[PDB]
Amino acid sequence: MIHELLLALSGYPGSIFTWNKRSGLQVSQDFPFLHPSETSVLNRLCRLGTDYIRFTEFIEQYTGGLHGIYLRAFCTGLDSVLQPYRQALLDLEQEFLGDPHLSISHVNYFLDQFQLLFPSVMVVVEQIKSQKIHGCQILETVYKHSCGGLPPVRSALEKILAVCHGVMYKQLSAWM
């Protein structure tokens, strides 16, 4: 349950939280071994995992159409921004090792800063798909959102943008 979740929060859905592309991380199974209202909680939490599953698929395919070394620079920084979310999945299991009384609310509380970083990058990846932008103008729509309005997304898109500029420093060494 606290291993099934910690893999449903990872990229392996299982019998509880089934994965579909028309609706991700579905729950409809009645649980007389839990409380009735807990499902409501769980629904909210599902949105955190879904994006993380979504984010991986994008990194998989993009590593004419949508191609280039630019497409190997956005995905590369998107790994680094998810890195404190991978570490934060190990931390939960380490806490579960000792305590038997830990509940869902602590997991919700702990991963609070990731409900603001993840959705505002989801719009960026959908914009990069819907528009056929594949050259240097990928950096533009990052640069508009890097100004930011919420503190998580101000630093993580910065992480990605620096890598883009560093790959440009190879082309603009060979040229100059």
Binding site: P36, S37, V41, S103, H106, D112, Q115, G149, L150, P151
Partner: protein
């Protein structure tokens, strides 16, 4: 019906999550029960009524980039303050399996005015952006209540960066 069920149900309506034998009736009404404890319950359940208003609005404005830097910072601050409310609630959840301290009436009392303040704060700043909003929060720190004057001052310090 049993009292132990009601304790856990009222423990969910702090989160803004309906109970089982206590349920939300309308948005214009607070949670009314599906006897003396039933009378006690309404004052405890007001916190979720406030919670819904704050959470819905910051949920919308987090997905809004037409709201600008000033104010998306404010919504970030509101989310950040609601996290602290979750920190207290999570312990109270986990201490299941003595937990009724006047059915936690004294426990909820320090958050109740803190939630009232933010529900007022968002509506005073409704329709404003930039320095127009900054004045609407700066009027709020000429106040004479020490708990509130301490509260508003750091949020404004965030907004004014």
């Amino acid at each position: 019906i049993t009292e132990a069920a009601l304790v856990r149900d009222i423990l969910y309506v702090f989160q803004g999550i309906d109970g089982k034998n206590i349920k939300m009736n309308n948005t214009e009404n607070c949670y009314k029960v599906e006897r003396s404890l039933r009378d006690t319950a309404v004052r405890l359940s007001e916190l979720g009524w406030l919670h819904n208003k704050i959470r819905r609005y910051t949920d919308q404005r987090s997905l809004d980039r037409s709201f600008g830097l000033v104010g998306q910072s404010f919504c970030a601050a509101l989310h950040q303050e609601l996290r602290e409310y979750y920190r207290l609630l999570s312990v109270l959840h986990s201490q299941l399996q003595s937990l009724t301290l006047r059915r936690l009436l004294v426990w909820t009392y320090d958050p109740k005015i803190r939630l009232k303040t933010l529900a007022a704060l968002v509506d005073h700043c409704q329709g404003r952006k930039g320095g127009e909003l900054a004045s609407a929060v700066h009027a709020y720190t000429k106040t004479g209540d020490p708990y509130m004057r301490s509260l508003v001052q750091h949020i404004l310090s965030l907004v004014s960066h």
